[PDB]
Design an enzyme around this catalytic site. Structure first.
Site, short mmCIF file in Angstrom:
data_model
loop_
_atom_site.label_atom_id
_atom_site.label_comp_id
_atom_site.label_asym_id
_atom_site.label_seq_id
_atom_site.Cartn_x
_atom_site.Cartn_y
_atom_site.Cartn_z
N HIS A 328 21.37 -44.02 18.70
CA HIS A 328 21.72 -43.67 20.08
C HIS A 328 20.52 -43.08 20.85
O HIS A 328 19.74 -42.30 20.30
CB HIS A 328 22.90 -42.70 20.12
N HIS A 373 16.35 -40.86 30.13
CA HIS A 373 17.75 -40.53 30.31
C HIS A 373 17.86 -40.15 31.76
O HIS A 373 17.41 -39.10 32.16
CB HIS A 373 18.18 -39.38 29.42
CA LIG Z 1 22.46 -43.79 26.83
#
Ligand SMILES: [Ca+2]
Length: 781
Positions: A328, A373
């Protein structure tokens, strides 16, 4: 079994000449680089000086050369390297970069320059293969003791003599424990002084094992030996057979696939063991105390089933039949919101074997796409750089297909560059069209991992009114937990054309998926989404996963990059259970230990009853599953060896992960032994896992901790193919790389179970999921 031990060529043992330099530095050094014959350490002498520097290959992460190495930028280092060796070849091509680290997040670097490109290439190929050699990575304690022996025989050795202080520095830092080493050496009859060295000729590995017997008080062996020998004196060929065949063997294991030892075979082994240990007194077909203890440490008693360790699983079933190693937000090295983004991390995660990576793609402010992000204080990296990295390391450790999970938020123009950059960096490895035999049409199963070796698949977008109010709110909660993944850019043709077998769609209902019948349509679900589906229709989820792929990822509220225990989702048959590789908690430790097996390929085949179309299964069952045979497991934690160089206080803990009804945490913990890092003797009564409903899904984990609850080491043993009996269990760190000598000694019982003989559906299920929490009693509230 195709796995082999390391085979270090004369060239590397004799050594090659390199210059070594460091970043942000004007000067350098010429060195003689070398590997020991068993291939455990790189070592070199820093010139006209004391000693030899070492790198323990157990923690080597990558060695690179030519175009993938880092050339020097400082003017006067560059000069050196050009005129070093042959002046023909461009400096880039002589360069070797080595990175190592006890864990893959905090790295250290070594920069080198060779004489030509062949040397570079050779060391690059050879050294890597040694570091990632599975047999070396799973060696039993006698192997690690030999590893130490080779350190002392090559690295520490000075003028054909092994200094005593070197033997001391390797085994202890504490003053009393060093004096134990002193006295142990004296018993053997070696020089015992602070300033003595032992002549190489007197220093054979067999006496170095008598040193082990003299050093540690393995009192455990007295009782073990009396159990088997009884009043008959020594262990006969016949007794030792029965020992190997009854106690050291799983009663279920198939007699003809895995033939019993024979009288004649055991004879041969007793001879080997008595030769190492007895010599003057050895008798034909008779095993002494020390012979037996040797065996228990030697390779033949290795806990690892080579058959399961090797790349031996059936690779020729649909992709949906496999647990796949997934990462992830691969790019993050740290915290989710303040953390750093890395190009290097992609290399490291692939090198562990991980097959599914994530790439959050954002519009970069100068025309060039970036990864980060979004809308956080995280740093940004270049997308172009990331894919070249992916291509470099995609298939070093595993030949089997990589899946790139793309979060796309780019402009149409920048998306054309994503596409182009994928072509540039991946060239032939990029699977941009389906393969023969698997068209993208309804009813056609996914291709097999075997069909898709050395290919990289792209998971990008390709080109429910009527609900109750609590459902709507449950969905809103899913959507925000999805974070930035909730909303994505629409797909640009040049990107959509690269997606085929891994088309993510907005999952609706389960009945919907089987009516559409499209094996190539998949669903990436945030954990909050998954738990909902899992609690509502668990059986339907298991059936869904027989044909199609489910990816699972951490909710946004896990800002620390915390992870869920993946057995929750593997229990439902979810294939791509993505974790944060930057966080070494219980979940990640478990993941890495599981994906070691099957040639560490990133792929593990689901248990048969989970791939059978016609068979219903409820992962929340508490009674036995028809067809599948339940088991008992008993772990008796006896002692440990070489936990530490300091005199620590330690305790051992044993957990189990799998079905809810088979998962046990914070239940089993040994007494604490105080002030002994060397041979703490716990002698704990066995820990019983009475009913293991479904062993094929279950793993067991031994954890060792320092008194304050600090991590020391651990070991993971899947129940599928576990070996019972007395076993040595060499501990590993959190990245599942060995500690070396640090080991535990346990007795294992594995057999089939035999017996004597309200609340809302999903409330009960949610309750079951607490078994996985770090605090199962309290979290159950
Ligand atoms: Ca993501």
């Amino acid at each position: 079994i195709e796995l082999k031990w390391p085979n270090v060529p004369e060239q590397l043992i004799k050594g090659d000449k390199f210059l070594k330099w460091e970043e942000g530095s004007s000067s350098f050094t010429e060195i003689l680089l070398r590997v020991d014959p068993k291939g455990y350490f790189l070592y070199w002498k820093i010139e006209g000086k004391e000693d030899s520097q070492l790198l323990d290959l157990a923690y080597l992460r990558d060695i690179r050369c030519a175009k993938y190495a880092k050339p020097p930028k400082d003017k006067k280092v560059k000069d050196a390297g050009t005129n070093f060796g042959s002046s023909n070849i461009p400096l880039q091509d002589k360069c070797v970069t080595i990175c190592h680290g006890y864990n893959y997040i905090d790295l250290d670097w070594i920069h080198l320059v060779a004489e030509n490109s062949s040397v570079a290439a050779k060391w690059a190929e050879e050294v890597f293969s040694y570091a990632y050699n599975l047999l070396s990575l799973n060696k039993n304690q006698l192997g690690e003791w030999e590893k130490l022996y080779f350190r002392l025989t090559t690295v520490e050795m000075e003028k054909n003599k092994i200094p005593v202080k070197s033997i001391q520095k390797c085994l202890s830092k504490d003053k009393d424990d060093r004096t134990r080493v002193a006295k142990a050496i004296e018993k053997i009859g070696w020089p015992s002084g602070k300033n003595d060295a032992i002549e190489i000729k007197a220093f054979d590995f067999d006496t170095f094992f008598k040193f082990y017997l003299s050093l540690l008080e393995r009192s455990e062996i007295e009782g073990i030996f009396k159990e088997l020998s009884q009043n008959k004196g020594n262990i006969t060929t016949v007794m030792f057979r029965d020992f190997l065949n009854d106690m050291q063997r799983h009663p279920s294991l198939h007699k003809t696939l895995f033939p019993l030892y024979t009288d004649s075979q055991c004879d041969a082994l007793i001879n080997e063991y008595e030769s190492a240990v007895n010599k003057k007194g050895k008798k034909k077909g008779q095993l002494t105390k020390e012979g037996l203890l040797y065996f228990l440490m030697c390779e033949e008693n290795n806990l690892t089933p080579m058959h399961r360790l090797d790349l031996g699983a059936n690779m020729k079933l649909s992709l949906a039949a496999y647990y796949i190693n997934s990462s992830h937000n691969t790019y993050l090295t740290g915290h989710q919101l303040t953390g750093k983004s890395s190009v290097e991390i992609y290399r490291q995660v692939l090198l562990t074997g991980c097959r599914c990576l994530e790439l959050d793609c954002w519009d970069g402010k100068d025309g060039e796409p970036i990864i980060t992000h979004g809308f956080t204080m995280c740093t940004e990296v270049q997308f172009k750089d990331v894919v070249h990295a992916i291509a470099e390391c995609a298939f070093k450790v595993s030949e089997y297909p990589v899946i790139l999970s793309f979060e796309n938020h780019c402009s149409v123009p920048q998306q054309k560059l994503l596409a182009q950059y994928c072509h540039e960096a991946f060239g032939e490895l990029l699977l941009d069209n389906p393969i023969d035999g698997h068209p993208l049409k309804p009813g056609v199963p996914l291709p097999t991992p075997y069909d898709l070796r050395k290919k990289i698949l792209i998971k990008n977008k390709k080109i429910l009114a009527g609900l109750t109010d609590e459902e709507k709110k449950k969905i809103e909660k899913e959507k925000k937990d999805a974070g930035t993944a909730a909303k994505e850019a629409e797909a640009a043709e040049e990107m959509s054309a690269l997606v085929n077998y891994i088309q993510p769609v907005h999952f609706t209902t389960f009945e919907q998926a089987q009516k559409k019948d499209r094996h190539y349509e998949m669903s990436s679900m945030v954990e909050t989404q998954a738990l909902n589906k899992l609690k509502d229709n668990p059986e339907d989820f298991v059936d869904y996963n027989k044909k199609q792929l489910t990816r699972i990822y951490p909710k946004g509220t896990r800002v620390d990059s915390s992870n869920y225990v993946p057995q929750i989702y593997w229990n439902a048959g979810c294939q791509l259970v993505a974790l944060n590789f930057q966080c070494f908690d219980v979940a990640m430790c478990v993941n890495l230990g599981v994906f070691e097996y099957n040639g560490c390929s990133g792929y593990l085949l689901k248990p048969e009853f989970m791939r059978k179309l016609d068979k219903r299964f409820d992962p929340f069952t508490e009674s036995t599953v028809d067809g599948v045979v339940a088991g008992t497991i008993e772990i008796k934690i006896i002692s440990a060896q070489f936990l530490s160089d300091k005199q620590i206080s330690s305790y051992v803990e044993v957990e189990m992960y799998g079905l809810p009804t088979d998962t046990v945490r914070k239940k089993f913990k040994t007494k604490t032994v105080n002030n002994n890092g060397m041979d703490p003797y716990y002698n704990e009564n066995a820990f019983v896992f009475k009913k293991v409903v479904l062993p094929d899904l279950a793993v067991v984990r031994i954890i060792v901790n320092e008194d304050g609850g600090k991590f020391i080491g651990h070991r993971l043993m899947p129940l599928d193919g576990i070996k019972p009996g007395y076993r040595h269990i060499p501990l590993r760190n959190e990245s599942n790389r060995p500690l070396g000598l640090a080991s535990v000694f346990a007795h294992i019982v594995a057999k089939d179970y035999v017996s004597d003989a309200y609340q809302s559906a999903q409330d009960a299920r949610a309750a079951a999921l607490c078994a996985f929490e770090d605090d199962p009693d309290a979290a159950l509230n």
